[PDB]
């Protein structure tokens, strides 16, 4: 979808390649750097508020 083409919703200057994972679903709205920062702050996923279990660097092929 077209939202993947937008800069990170947080820093607005890196691509959306940070998948925030919880169970078997993930929200991809931030870059890897900001997603990790959120986990480090102990924040919940900014979309659905689930505990962030895993942060993954995503490559689109």
């Amino acid at each position: 979808c077209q939202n993947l083409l937008k800069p990170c919703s947080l820093c607005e200057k890196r691509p959306r390649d940070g998948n925030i994972i919880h169970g078997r679903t993930g929200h991809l709205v931030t870059c890897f750097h900001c997603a990790r920062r959120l986990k480090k702050a102990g924040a919940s996923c900014p979309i659905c508020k689930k505990e962030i279990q895993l942060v993954i660097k995503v490559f689109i092929a």
Binding site: C1, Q2, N3, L4, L5, R16, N19, I21, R24, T25, G26, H27, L28, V29, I47, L54, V55, I56, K57, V58, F59, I60, A61
Partner: protein, 60 residues
């Protein structure tokens, strides 16, 4: 970009099946097709590492 092209495998759904290995993920297939790769015990088609899990990815 590859991001606005559909699943490479079925070409009928978005690339929302994240293939997870380690701290990295390959997005090229939908959730349904990506699950099939794991079930049939295929490695990641892109980097050929084992698939740890499939994550339904929303981009919302």
């Amino acid at each position: 970009l590859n991001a606005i092209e559909p699943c490479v495998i079925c070409q009928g759904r978005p690339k929302n099946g994240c293939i997870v290995h380690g701290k990295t993920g390959h997005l090229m297939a939908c959730f349904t097709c990506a699950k099939k790769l794991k079930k049939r015990n295929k490695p990641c088609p892109v980097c050929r590492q084992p698939i740890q899990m499939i994550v339904l990815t929303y981009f919302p």
